Point group: C3
Chain length 185, copies 3
């Protein structure tokens, strides 16, 4: 049962707006804490490795690491969002039927996760990024602003998809995949 | 007057979420049916030619083929959405003043149809795709994920616009228009 | 205190839908007016220089030039939207923590303004365009449909970012920056 207050470990303020939107009445920023009263906890760190290590430590200190899910995000009843798993879901995100979102994932504003996708733990899906149906995003991946991945593709663990970039082919090996930069005329 | 149940002919589950969102209480999947009770009917087939042939046959069997329009889609009062025409409108779609959407069209999640557009019958507008003002999309067109068409342009019947692609010029002849694939670095 | 009617100077109809959505009961299109009853006023002109000159003149005739902000736009409590400044905010726009939107700006449908951005006066942010965190958009800029600007960048006054284009580097000089056109295959 969500507490009335939340510990939140730029991004802080943004996670705070999401927490207020959910109906948290007060947010406490942190930057031995096991002696504090056990309010719900959230880790507002954009970086995949720090999010993970802090997640593991806060968990070991006896806190519940909740999910922050903006009220305007739409999640299919048959989708699976791992419960109390530090998952950030921003405004206007849409997650379709039977998709699965794992622990520590960030789904930023307007991203879309089509039917039957799996978004692996601690991945980062940026603003406007889109994953078509049955896409598998490995753990610790980053999908850039306004990027997208075509249907039925897999992106291996620790990969990076650039701003504006469109993934068209399976990748079972780690990699860095770029789009086109705007050009001065 | 919409029935309490709906026949729906991955995509099924997704159309089912849209139907539940509208307030349908039960969805019946189909994959002689004229002897069945006449609930509302919807065709959850992504493919433009099958959607059409099944549409025509179901119509000839005496069913009403309804539109499924998610409650979060925003449609200008002066826009025209052909009534009971098998049109799928997904979450967060925006259709602006005096636009016209014809029979059998799919408007997927977050697509936007600006003022005075015409989206011709059985076309498919994918997730995040955008049509600027006064754009004419012919019948049986496909606009890829995160694509877009600049203002005042026409795309001829049976054309295809790739993922991520930006249409910049009129096309009065059928064609296939591609964007840039992400490149491994 | 907003009046029940509004003067609105394609785009007219669209601004009218936004005004009705806010709860204006009647819109009056204009295309000596100081002798008219002082309803709220809005300038529905897409062009940055005309918007400005008309803004200045209408202001000098004693009208209040209001902001039109669709109810579905989400604005952080710590964001600053200049009050009664002719700012158009369209459906599903998201403006994050501590961002600042200046006078005469257009934020079109689904654009996103991340934390700590500044969007300078009379700029135009098109449908689906996205500005990442701490981005500074100068005055009279235009950001094309589905474009985007990476984090921590500045775009100098009077610049243009094309449809589909992704800005990757600081620009302290005025310029024109293009994306890739779809190519017939
Ligand atoms: O959980 C809800 O409130 C909800 C979810 C949806 C939906 C999710 C995907 C398509 O529609 N529609 N409503
Ligand atoms: O929305 C976000 O978290 C985000 C993603 C990016 C980015 C950097 C390079 C490509 O996209 N910058 N900010
Ligand atoms: O029909 C409605 O409920 C509605 C539609 C809109 C709108 C449509 C386009 C811009 O605003 N705003 N509200
Ligand atoms: O949202 C959809 O229906 C969709 C569109 C696509 C696609 C395939 C190639 C370019 O976009 N894949 N899925
Ligand atoms: O002002 C509101 O009603 C509101 C704003 C937000 C928000 C803004 C950015 C992220 O969440 N969430 N709710
Ligand atoms: O949404 C709008 O106001 C808009 C922007 C554009 C455009 C023209 C070239 C690149 O984007 N066309 N319409």
């Amino acid at each position: 049962a969500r507490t009335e207050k939340i510990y939140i470990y730029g991004h802080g303020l943004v996670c705070e707006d999401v927490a207020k939107n959910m109906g948290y009445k007060e947010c406490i920023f942190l930057d031995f804490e096991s002696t504090l009263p056990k309010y719900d906890f959230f880790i507002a760190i954009g970086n995949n490795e720090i999010r993970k290590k802090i997640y593991q430590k806060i968990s070991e200190n006896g806190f519940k690491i909740v999910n922050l899910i903006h009220k305007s995000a739409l999640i299919s009843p048959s989708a699976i969002v791992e419960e109390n798993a530090g998952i950030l879901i921003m405004p206007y995100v849409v997650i379709n039927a039977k998709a699965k979102i794992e622990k520590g994932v960030i789904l930023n504003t307007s991203s879309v996760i089509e039917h039957e996708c799996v978004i692996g733990e601690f991945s980062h899906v940026s603003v406007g990024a889109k994953c078509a149906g049955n896409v598998k995003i490995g753990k610790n991946c980053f999908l850039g602003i306004n990027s997208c991945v075509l249907p039925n593709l897999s992106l291996a663990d620790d990969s990076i998809l650039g701003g504006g970039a469109t993934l068209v082919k399976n990748q079972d090996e780690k990699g860095v995949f770029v789009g086109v930069p705007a050009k001065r005329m």
